[PDB]
Amino acid sequence: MQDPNADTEWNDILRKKGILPPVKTYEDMTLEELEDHE
Amino acid sequence: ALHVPKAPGFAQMLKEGAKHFSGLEEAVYRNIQACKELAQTTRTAYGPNGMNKMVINHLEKLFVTNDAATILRELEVQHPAAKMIVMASHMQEQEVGDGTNFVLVFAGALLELAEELLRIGLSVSEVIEGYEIACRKAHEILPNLVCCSAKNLRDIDEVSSLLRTSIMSKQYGNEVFLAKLIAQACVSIFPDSGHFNVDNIRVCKILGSGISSSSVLHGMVFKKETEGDVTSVKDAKIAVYSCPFDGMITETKGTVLIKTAEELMNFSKGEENLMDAQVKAIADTGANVVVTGGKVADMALHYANKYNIMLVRLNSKWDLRRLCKTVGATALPRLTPPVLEEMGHCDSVYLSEVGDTQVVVFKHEKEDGAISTIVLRGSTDNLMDDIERAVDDGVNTFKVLTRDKRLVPGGGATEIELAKQITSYGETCPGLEQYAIKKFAEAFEAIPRALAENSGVKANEVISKLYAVHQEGNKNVGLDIEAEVPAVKDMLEAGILDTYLGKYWAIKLATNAAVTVLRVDQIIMAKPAGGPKPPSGK
Amino acid sequence: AALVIDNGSGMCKAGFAGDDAPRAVFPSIKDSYVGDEAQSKRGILTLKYPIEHGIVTNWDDMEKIWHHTFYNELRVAPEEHPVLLTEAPLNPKANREKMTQIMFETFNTPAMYVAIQAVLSLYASGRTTGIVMDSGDGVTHTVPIYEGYALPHAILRLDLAGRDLTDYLMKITTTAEREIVRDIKEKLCYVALDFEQEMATALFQPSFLGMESCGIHETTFNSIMKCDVDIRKDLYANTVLSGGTTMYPGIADRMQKEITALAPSTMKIKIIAPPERKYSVWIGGSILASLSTFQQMWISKQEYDESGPSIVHRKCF
Amino acid sequence: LVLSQNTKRESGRKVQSGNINAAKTIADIIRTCLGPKSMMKMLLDPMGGIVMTNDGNAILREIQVQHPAAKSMIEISRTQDEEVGDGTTSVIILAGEMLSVAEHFLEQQMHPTVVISAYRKALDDMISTLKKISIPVDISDSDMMLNIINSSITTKAISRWSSLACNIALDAVKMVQFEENGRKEIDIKKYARVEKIPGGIIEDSCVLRGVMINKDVTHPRMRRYIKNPRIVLLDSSLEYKKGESQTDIEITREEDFTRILQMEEEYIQQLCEDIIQLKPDVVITEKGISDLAQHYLMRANITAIRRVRKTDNNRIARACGARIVSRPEELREDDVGTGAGLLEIKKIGDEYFTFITDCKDPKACTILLRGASKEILSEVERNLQDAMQVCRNVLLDPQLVPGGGASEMAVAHALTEKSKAMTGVEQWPYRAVAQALEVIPRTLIQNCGASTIRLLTSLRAKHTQENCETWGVNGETGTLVDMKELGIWEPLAVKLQTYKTAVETAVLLLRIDDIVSGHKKKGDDQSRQGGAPDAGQE
Amino acid sequence: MAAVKTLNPKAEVARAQAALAVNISAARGLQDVLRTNLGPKGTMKMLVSGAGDIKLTKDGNVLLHEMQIQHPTASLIAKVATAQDDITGDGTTSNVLIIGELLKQADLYISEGLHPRIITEGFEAAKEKALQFLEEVKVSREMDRETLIDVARTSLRTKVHAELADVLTEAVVDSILAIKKQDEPIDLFMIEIMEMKHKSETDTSLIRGLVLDHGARHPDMKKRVEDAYILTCNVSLEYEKTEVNSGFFYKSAEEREKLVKAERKFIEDRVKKIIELKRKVCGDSDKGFVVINQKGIDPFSLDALSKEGIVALRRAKRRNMERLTLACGGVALNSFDDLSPDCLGHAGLVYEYTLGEEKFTFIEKCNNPRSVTLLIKGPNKHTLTQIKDAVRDGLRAVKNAIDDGCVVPGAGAVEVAMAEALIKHKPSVKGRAQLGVQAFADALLIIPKVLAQNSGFDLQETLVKIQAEHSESGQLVGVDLNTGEPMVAAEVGVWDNYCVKKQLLHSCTVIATNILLVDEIMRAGMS
Numbered sequence A: 001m002q003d004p005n006a007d008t009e010w011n012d013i014l015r016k017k018g019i020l021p022p023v024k025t026y027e028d029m030t031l032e033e034l035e036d037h038e
Numbered sequence B: 001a002l003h004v005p006k007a008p009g010f011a012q013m014l015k016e017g018a019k020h021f022s023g024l025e026e027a028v029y030r031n032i033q034a035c036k037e038l039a040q041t042t043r044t045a046y047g048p049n050g051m052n053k054m055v056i057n058h059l060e061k062l063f064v065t066n067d068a069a070t071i072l073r074e075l076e077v078q079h080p081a082a083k084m085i086v087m088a089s090h091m092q093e094q095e096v097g098d099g100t101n102f103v104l105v106f107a108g109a110l111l112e113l114a115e116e117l118l119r120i121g122l123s124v125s126e127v128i129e130g131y132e133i134a135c136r137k138a139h140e141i142l143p144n145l146v147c148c149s150a151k152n153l154r155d156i157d158e159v160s161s162l163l164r165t166s167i168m169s170k171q172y173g174n175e176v177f178l179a180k181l182i183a184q185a186c187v188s189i190f191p192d193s194g195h196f197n198v199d200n201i202r203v204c205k206i207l208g209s210g211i212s213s214s215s216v217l218h219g220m221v222f223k224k225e226t227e228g229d230v231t232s233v234k235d236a237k238i239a240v241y242s243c244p245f246d247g248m249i250t251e252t253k254g255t256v257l258i259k260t261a262e263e264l265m266n267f268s269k270g271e272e273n274l275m276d277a278q279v280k281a282i283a284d285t286g287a288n289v290v291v292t293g294g295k296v297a298d299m300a301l302h303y304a305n306k307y308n309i310m311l312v313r314l315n316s317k318w319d320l321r322r323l324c325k326t327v328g329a330t331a332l333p334r335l336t337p338p339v340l341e342e343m344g345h346c347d348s349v350y351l352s353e354v355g356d357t358q359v360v361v362f363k364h365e366k367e368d369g370a371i372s373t374i375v376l377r378g379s380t381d382n383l384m385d386d387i388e389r390a391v392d393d394g395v396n397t398f399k400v401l402t403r404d405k406r407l408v409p410g411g412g413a414t415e416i417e418l419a420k421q422i423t424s425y426g427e428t429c430p431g432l433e434q435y436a437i438k439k440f441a442e443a444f445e446a447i448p449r450a451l452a453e454n455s456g457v458k459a460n461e462v463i464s465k466l467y468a469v470h471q472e473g474n475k476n477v478g479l480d481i482e483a484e485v486p487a488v489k490d491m492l493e494a495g496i497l498d499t500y501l502g503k504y505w506a507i508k509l510a511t512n513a514a515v516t517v518l519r520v521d522q523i524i525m526a527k528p529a530g531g532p533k534p535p536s537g538k
Numbered sequence C: 001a002a003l004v005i006d007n008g009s010g011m012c013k014a015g016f017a018g019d020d021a022p023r024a025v026f027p028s029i030k031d032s033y034v035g036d037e038a039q040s041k042r043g044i045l046t047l048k049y050p051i052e053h054g055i056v057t058n059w060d061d062m063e064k065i066w067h068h069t070f071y072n073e074l075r076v077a078p079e080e081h082p083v084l085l086t087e088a089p090l091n092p093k094a095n096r097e098k099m100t101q102i103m104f105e106t107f108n109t110p111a112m113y114v115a116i117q118a119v120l121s122l123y124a125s126g127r128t129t130g131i132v133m134d135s136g137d138g139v140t141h142t143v144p145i146y147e148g149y150a151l152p153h154a155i156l157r158l159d160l161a162g163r164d165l166t167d168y169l170m171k172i173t174t175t176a177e178r179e180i181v182r183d184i185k186e187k188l189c190y191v192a193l194d195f196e197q198e199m200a201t202a203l204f205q206p207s208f209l210g211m212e213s214c215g216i217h218e219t220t221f222n223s224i225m226k227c228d229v230d231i232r233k234d235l236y237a238n239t240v241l242s243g244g245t246t247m248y249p250g251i252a253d254r255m256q257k258e259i260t261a262l263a264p265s266t267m268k269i270k271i272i273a274p275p276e277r278k279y280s281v282w283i284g285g286s287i288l289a290s291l292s293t294f295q296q297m298w299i300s301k302q303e304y305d306e307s308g309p310s311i312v313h314r315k316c317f
Numbered sequence D: 001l002v003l004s005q006n007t008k009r010e011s012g013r014k015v016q017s018g019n020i021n022a023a024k025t026i027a028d029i030i031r032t033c034l035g036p037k038s039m040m041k042m043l044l045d046p047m048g049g050i051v052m053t054n055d056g057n058a059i060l061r062e063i064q065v066q067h068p069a070a071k072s073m074i075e076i077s078r079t080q081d082e083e084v085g086d087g088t089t090s091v092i093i094l095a096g097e098m099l100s101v102a103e104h105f106l107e108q109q110m111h112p113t114v115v116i117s118a119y120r121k122a123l124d125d126m127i128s129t130l131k132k133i134s135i136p137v138d139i140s141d142s143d144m145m146l147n148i149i150n151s152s153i154t155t156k157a158i159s160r161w162s163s164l165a166c167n168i169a170l171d172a173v174k175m176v177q178f179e180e181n182g183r184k185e186i187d188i189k190k191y192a193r194v195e196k197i198p199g200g201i202i203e204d205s206c207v208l209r210g211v212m213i214n215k216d217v218t219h220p221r222m223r224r225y226i227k228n229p230r231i232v233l234l235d236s237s238l239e240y241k242k243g244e245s246q247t248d249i250e251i252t253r254e255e256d257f258t259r260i261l262q263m264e265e266e267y268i269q270q271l272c273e274d275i276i277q278l279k280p281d282v283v284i285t286e287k288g289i290s291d292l293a294q295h296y297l298m299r300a301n302i303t304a305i306r307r308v309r310k311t312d313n314n315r316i317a318r319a320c321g322a323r324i325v326s327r328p329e330e331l332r333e334d335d336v337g338t339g340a341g342l343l344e345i346k347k348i349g350d351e352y353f354t355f356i357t358d359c360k361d362p363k364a365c366t367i368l369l370r371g372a373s374k375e376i377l378s379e380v381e382r383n384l385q386d387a388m389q390v391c392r393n394v395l396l397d398p399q400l401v402p403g404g405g406a407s408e409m410a411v412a413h414a415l416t417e418k419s420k421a422m423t424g425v426e427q428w429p430y431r432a433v434a435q436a437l438e439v440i441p442r443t444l445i446q447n448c449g450a451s452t453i454r455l456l457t458s459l460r461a462k463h464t465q466e467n468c469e470t471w472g473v474n475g476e477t478g479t480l481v482d483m484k485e486l487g488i489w490e491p492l493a494v495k496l497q498t499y500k501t502a503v504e505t506a507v508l509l510l511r512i513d514d515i516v517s518g519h520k521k522k523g524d525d526q527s528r529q530g531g532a533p534d535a536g537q538e
Numbered sequence E: 001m002a003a004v005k006t007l008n009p010k011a012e013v014a015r016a017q018a019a020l021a022v023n024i025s026a027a028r029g030l031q032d033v034l035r036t037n038l039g040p041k042g043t044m045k046m047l048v049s050g051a052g053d054i055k056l057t058k059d060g061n062v063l064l065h066e067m068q069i070q071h072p073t074a075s076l077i078a079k080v081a082t083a084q085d086d087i088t089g090d091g092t093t094s095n096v097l098i099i100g101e102l103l104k105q106a107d108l109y110i111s112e113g114l115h116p117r118i119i120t121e122g123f124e125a126a127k128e129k130a131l132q133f134l135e136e137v138k139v140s141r142e143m144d145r146e147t148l149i150d151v152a153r154t155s156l157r158t159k160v161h162a163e164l165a166d167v168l169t170e171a172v173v174d175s176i177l178a179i180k181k182q183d184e185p186i187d188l189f190m191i192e193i194m195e196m197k198h199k200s201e202t203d204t205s206l207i208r209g210l211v212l213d214h215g216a217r218h219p220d221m222k223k224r225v226e227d228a229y230i231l232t233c234n235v236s237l238e239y240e241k242t243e244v245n246s247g248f249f250y251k252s253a254e255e256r257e258k259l260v261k262a263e264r265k266f267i268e269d270r271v272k273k274i275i276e277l278k279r280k281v282c283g284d285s286d287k288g289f290v291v292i293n294q295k296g297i298d299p300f301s302l303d304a305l306s307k308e309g310i311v312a313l314r315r316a317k318r319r320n321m322e323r324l325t326l327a328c329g330g331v332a333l334n335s336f337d338d339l340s341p342d343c344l345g346h347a348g349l350v351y352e353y354t355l356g357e358e359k360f361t362f363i364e365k366c367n368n369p370r371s372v373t374l375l376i377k378g379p380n381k382h383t384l385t386q387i388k389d390a391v392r393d394g395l396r397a398v399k400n401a402i403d404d405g406c407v408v409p410g411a412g413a414v415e416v417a418m419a420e421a422l423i424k425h426k427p428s429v430k431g432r433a434q435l436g437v438q439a440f441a442d443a444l445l446i447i448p449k450v451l452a453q454n455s456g457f458d459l460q461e462t463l464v465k466i467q468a469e470h471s472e473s474g475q476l477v478g479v480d481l482n483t484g485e486p487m488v489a490a491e492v493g494v495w496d497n498y499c500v501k502k503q504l505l506h507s508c509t510v511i512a513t514n515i516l517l518v519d520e521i522m523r524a525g526m527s
Ligand SMILES: Nc1ncnc2c1ncn2[C@@H]1O[C@H](COP(=O)(O)OP(=O)(O)O)[C@@H](O)[C@H]1O
Pocket: B045, B046, B047, B048, B050, B068, B098, B099, B100, B101, B102, B103, B165, B168, B169, B170, B409, B410, B411, B412, B447, B451, B478, B479, B480, B481, B496, B497, B498
C-alpha cells in the first residue's frame, strides 16, 4: 500500500472500506503397562 | 486458568490500540529513559571535538552535521517525553540560535539525577521544588560569572574574536576564516540604530572551490540570468516593479472588439507603440536596470534591449523585497516611470559565472548597505549546508550580543562554577530539598564531562582538575581542547567565551523541560493515526 | 457521525461517514399515501443543478438542494452532525465563504470542513501522496498532493475535458449527432501510444485539437517539477487518474510513456487508474470524516462565530 | 555472505546497558516480595496450574525470558535456592543494585575490568566483615533454633502458624540427622518427605515419628492395625516371572503341563516361606505381589503392601530400621525392621493411607500437611522447605548474623571505612558496592510504606557509631530497632552465599560487551557430550 | 507496559488494584451463579456437556466443575470447594458464598484506601473468635436414629425433592447405622451404591445385602437360590497358559487328544475342589451354592459347576470381595489349597434380575451384614446421577454427625449468632483490624441472607428480625423458609455438621486472606 501496514487507524478504515486486504488412559496402556499401576 | 483478563473499568473500556501508563514505574522512569536515550543520541556532537552525524530522513535526504537542533528535526522522535525535550531545544534555537545541545544534555542529566533521587526516596514534587529553587539560584549566580563584554560591535577584529567561539563548535578546523567573514557581513549590516536583523544576512551556496573561496558581498546575488542583451552596468539606476514587464490588462475580462478593418489593422501597431512609450519613459528617467517580479513580454524585452536596459526577473516576492532594501528602491505595482525617490542605485550590477553557476550580482562598493550576502564556495552541498548552519550560529550570536553584550567563560568554566556554587547553596539548605539542589548542581558537570569525553580524554580527571582550580579561586578556567592529556586553562585569556543570554535561556528552558517531564504521572496514548498530518502545519 | 456531502460537480452523493456508498444521490435519484412526501420532492426534481463546470452559479438553489438533502433524503438534523463538503481545485475564496456562511448560519452545523475533490479521490484509492489528474465534463485539473494536502502552489489548470475531447471528433453539428459522436466518446476510445501505428491500420498534443498551451502529460510533469525534489519520486510514481473523461479513452500508458520521457531517467512512474468505483470522492470524504484528524481539522461553529470569512479562509493571507 | 543470515551481533555500550537493564528488570519483578510485609503473586503455569507465592525462586522459575542477562539472573536464583534454600530475592535485588552502580561507572570511561577488580576486593572485605560481626549459637538450644527458623518464616505466608511450622521443621531436621561411618549428613531432599492432603485444617498438620504412603492392603483380610510390626522390605516381585534367557519348554507327556503350573505355585510357596521364616508382621514391596503369595502371607497372618515407590521404601527403611532385600532366601533378622511402634491403615477422606508412625529413632519422617487446597499446601510446602533448609544451614555452620538489613548496613559501613585508605581509582567502585548493599534495608522500608530517605539516613548514621552493627529495620512498623531486641537473625551461611552470588554475577555480566545470536546448534548426532580419546594419560 | 512485559513481550499482568479487581470480580461472579443453589428453595440447574449429556444438579462442587469457566480465581475457589467435598461431602456452595462475600466486604474497605493486610489481620482475629463461638454452641448429642434422620433430612432436602428426600433419609441412615461398628471409624466403601434405570425414583431402596451388576453366564445355572452358601474367591477358574512359553508337541492325533484333555487338569482340579466342598456342605438339593470369583471362569468350568448345581458369577469387583465377606460372612480366597466349610458365608436368598440387556444378582437375607447396598432406581440417567450425588451428601452428613458426635443448628442460625458475637468482640481488637472483623461478620451473614433471597423474602427485613430475636432471647435462630420468620433450628430439626462449619471457617478465611494479599497476577511462561 501507499503507507506501511501497521497498528494505525488509517489502515483500519481502509480495511473497513474494502482496500488493503487483511499416561493418558488405561485404553492405550498395554498388558505390561496395565500391571505397572493396577 | 490460562489467561489474565483485563481488570474491570478503564482497562476494559480502553480502546483497542490505545496505551495507558501510570505511576513512577510505567510512566516516570520510562519517560526519563527516553530522554536519556535522546541525550545519548546527541551527546557525541557537543563541542568543537563533536563529531558529525549523517541523518537520512523519510524523504531520503541527507544531513551531515553536529548541530543538535538540525539532527533532532531530521530525526523522527516518537516518544512524547523526548518530543517535549526536543520542543524545548527548538525553543532555544528560536530564541537564541545556539545552545540546543546544551539544552538536551542538561535536560537529560537533570532527568537521570531525578530518577536517582526518586529511587532513594524523594517525591516528584520535592524533586521539582529543588530543581526550581536551584534554577533560581543558577539565574541569581550567572550574572556574577560574566567576565567580558563586547564593548564594540562596529569593529571587525573584536567581533571576529567574539563570534569565533560560536562558529568553533561547528567547523572547528576553519574558525578564523569563517569568523572573519561573518564579522564582515554582520558589521556591514547593523546600522547606527541598535536593531540588527538576521534575515538581512543572505547566504548563497555555489559549488566547487573549497570553503576558503567563500566571500562577503555588500549587496545581493541571484542565481539567475539576464532576460535581455545587456549584462553589465556600472552606475545602476535600478527600477523595481512588482508587476510584470508587459502591458497592463483588465482584472475583469478583456476582449478586443473589432468592427472595422481599420481597427484590426491598427490594433497591433498601437500595442507595440504603447509598449515603446512605456519603456522609453522608464529609460528616460535614467534607469539602466529594471527588475520585475513578474513575467517579461517579448515586445517589452525588445524595447528594453533597444534602449539598453538590463532586465532581471525575480520569481520570488521575498527576493524582490530584499533587493528593494538592498538598492534603496520601491516596488511599483504599475509600469509607470519611477520618481527620483522610488529609484534604487548600485555601484555595479552585472552577470557573472561563479563556478558552474550563472549569477546576477547587485554589488555596492561602500562597506555598508541594508543587506549583505555570504557567497559560500565548497566541494559538496552537504558541506556547504553545514557551513551555512555555522554562519547562522555566528549571526545569531551577533544578534544576542546586540541584545545583551555580556559574556561568560566557556569550555565548561561557567558550568563548573555553577555546579560548585549551587552545591555550596544546597549544603546550606536543610530539608529534603538539598538532595535535589545538589543533583541540579552536579548536572552542570555533564557539560565539561561531554567536552572531555569528546576531546578524547578522561572526563573524571578533567572534572577533578576543574573543581580543584575553581576552588583556588579561578572562575574563568575551563578545559583545554589542545591537549592529548587532561588539561585546563584560562577560558578568558584564551578567548573562549559564551553569551550570558545563551546560558540564561538554555538553563531556563532545560530546567522547565525536565520539570515538565517530571510532572507527568499518567500517559494515555491514542492509537496512531493515518491522518494526512496536522492541517495547520501543512 | 459526520455527513459527507460530495458535490463533485455531479450530484449531491450525500450520506454518513462509515457508509461505503452515499445515501442521498439527489439529482436523478410513496404516492397515494397521505402527507407532503412527494410534492416537496416534486418541487426539487425539476430544479436546475447549481454547479456548472465545477463552480457554483446559483447559491439559493444549492442551499435549497442541501436543505432537501438533509430533511428529506436523509431525514436527519445538521445541528448535531459535522459536515464534510467538497470543492473543486482552485475554487474562489468567495464560494468558500458563501458555503461556510450557509452551513454555519442556516444549517447551524457544529463543525464543517471543505476538502478538494482530487484529494478525496486519492484518499479513496488508499494513498495520501501523489498527483491526481481529474478530467470531468467541464474542466481538467492536475493536483499534486503531499502528506494528504493539495499543494496550493503547483496546481496547473488546463482545459481539455469531455467537451473539448468530443469536439474534434464532431469535427470528423446538431445536438443529437454530436451526441452520437459523444456516444462513441462514452464507449471504447482506446488511447493511442502512437497515433502513427494507430492510424496505420485504418489532449497530449494541443495542435491536434487546435489549442496552443500544453498537453496533459506536460501539465503533470510541470506540476511535479514545481514541488519538492525529494517528494518528486512520490509524485512521479503515484500519479492517480480520475474523471469519466479520462476513463473513456482509458489513457494510462501513453501518458506514462511520455511522462517517463519528460522526467529524468531515475524515478519510475506507475499510474493507478483502474478503480472506477463511481463514488471515489464520496469514499475519500467518508474516510476523512471517519478519521480523528478530521476532528482536528474541524472549522468549528465557535471558530466561525469568532472569525467569519477569515476562519473559512484559514488566515495566512 | 560470511556468517549465516540468522546471525545477529550487537557490541559495545549498547550491550552493557542492555544487560544491566535486563538485570534491573528481573530485580524489579520481585523487589516487592522481600520482607515480612511482602505480598503474594498468582502466576499461571502453562499447564493450567496456579502458583501463589512470595518466594523469589518460585516466581523467577515460573517466568521465562529471552534476554540472556535475565536468564543469568534466574540462574542466580536457582543457584541460591539449591545451595542455601533462602535469599532468592535478596540475591536478585543485590545483583541488580550492583549492576546499576556499575552502569554508573561504565557510562564514564572506566573499563569493566577495573570495576570487576573493585568488586572482588569488596567481596573479600564483605566476607571478612560478615565473619567479624557474626555470633555463634548453641545448636542444642531448641528455643534458639526455633527463633532462628521464625526469623526465616516470618516473611512467608505461613507466618500465621509460626510455632507449628517452626516445630515441624525443627523436629524434621533433627530426626533426619544421620551419621554413618564418620560422615555427618542431613539429606532433607530424600528423607523428610512432605505429603499434603488437601482438606482438614492446617493446625492439625504434623510431622510423624515415621512415614506415610498412599497405599492400602493387597487383600481385605489383612490387618490394618499392628502395634509392634516386624517389617520386611523387598525390591523383588513376589510373583513368578520369566527368566532372562530363551527358556522355551517342550511338552510331550500329559503330566507336564499340570506339573509345570504346580511348579509355579510351589515356587511362590517357597518365596513366601523364605519370608515367613523371619516371622514379620508387614511385608512391603516395590514390585508386585501375586495373589497366591498374598494367600500364603495371609495364612502366616502377614499384612502385605505392594507397588511402593523406591524412594518411599528407602524412607521406610530409614524409619523402621530395616534393610531392603531382593532375594527372600537372603533374608536375615538384621534386615528385618524393628523400631516401628505402630502400623495403621486409615481412610483419610476417601483414600487409604498407610502410617508407620510410632517409630523409635526414625532417621526419616513424613510431614503431613492439611489445608484448604492444593495451591495453599504447595505454598506451605515451599515455606517449610525454606525453614528446614535454614535449620540445616544453621546446624552445619552455627554462626548467626543480624537481619532487618543490619548486616547490610554494618558491612556497608565497614567497606566505606576501609575505602578511605585506598587512594587509587578503584575506590569509587568500591564505595559504590558498599553503598549498594543498602538496597536490602531500603527495599524493606519500601514494603512497609514508610519514608526511605529519613529512615535510611537515620540508620546509616546509627551504623557509624561503635557498637551499632546490630541496628536495622522493623519491617512491620517502619522503624529502627536493635536486632537483639527484635529477634531477626539470619544464618551466616545464607548471607555469605547471598553476597557471593550477587558479586560474582555482577562480575559475570560486566565482562560482557558483545552478543552473537541466531547461530544454530551444530549438534544433532544424539547430543554429543564427551566421547573422544586424549593424549595418553598414562 | 510493565517490568514483565519488557522481558517476555507476550506476558499478561494484573498489578495491585487491577489484580484485586480481577480476583474480586471473579469471586462475585461465582457467588452470583451459586447463590441460587443454597437451601431447599433453591433451583436445579441443567448442565449439558459438549457431547449432549444432561446433569440436573444443585450441588456447588458439581456446578463448579460443570460450569464453563476459565478464570484463575475460579480455579482457586473450585479447588477449595473440591477439598471441602473430598473431606466433608457438603459445604461447597456455602464455601463459595462465604469466600465471595468475604472478598466483597473487604473490597468495601479497601476501596476506602485501607490496606488489605489490615483486613487479613482482622480476618484472623475473627476466625479465632468464630471458632471459639462454634465450639461453644455445638450440641454434643448421642447419635440416635432420630437425630441422624434429621441430619440426613437437612442434607437430602437441599439436594433433592421432598418425597425423594424423605425416602433417601431412611435409606441413608439405615445404611450407615447398619455398616457401623461400635467406636470404629465408618468405612463408606462398605456401602455399595448400585443404580438401576427402570422404575420410579421413589423406589430407591436399601438392600441389606449386596447387589452385583452381573450374573451367571451359563444358562443352565439357577436364577434363584434360597439358602445359599457363598464362596468368595479370587482364583482363576479359566485356562491359564504357562509363564515360560511351553507349547505342546505330539506325533499323533491321539496324543493331541490326550494333551487336550491334560492341558485343563490344573483347572479341573480347582473346580473339583469347589464341587467337593459343595457336596460335603450340602449333600442334597435343599440348600444352594454360589461362587463369586474376582477372576474368570471359562465355559468348561461353568459347565462343570452347573452340572452340580452351583451358581457361579465371575469377574466381580475387587471391593465386592470385602463387601461379600463382611455381608455374607465367609473368607475371600486366592487359592483352594486348604478350603473348609468355615470359608463360606450364608445368604438367606440369592437371585437374578434382568433389566434390558444387563443382569443383576441380589444377595439378601444375610444375618447381620456389616455391608449393604443402596439401589438407586430411577427413570433417567440424570435422575440416577442426581440421586447418587444426594446420597453421597447424605452419607457424608450422617458419617460426620456420628464421628463428630456434636451437631450444630442450621438455617443460618450459627452464622447469625457468630456475627453478633464477632460484633460484640470487635472493641477488644486493636487498630483498624476491627474493620476486618466487621467484614468477617457481614460475610458470615451471607448464608441467612441467601436463604431468605431464595425463599422469596426481603434479605434486610428478615435479617433484622432474626438478629433482633437472637439478641432479645439468645435462642439460636435461623430462617423459616415458609414464613420468613425466625425459628429455633435445634427445635425444628435443622442440623448441620460441626465439622462442616469448622472446615468452612478455616478454608474460607485462609483462601480469602491469600487472595486479598495477591498484588500481581502474571502469565509469563509462554514461548
Ligand atoms: N575552543 C573551545 N574549547 C573548549 N570548549 C569550547 C571551545 N569552543 C566551544 N566550546 C564549548 O562547546 C560548547 C558548545 O558547543 P556546541 O556543540 O555548539 O553546543 P551548543 O549547540 O549548545 O552551542 C560550549 O560549552 C562551549 O563553551
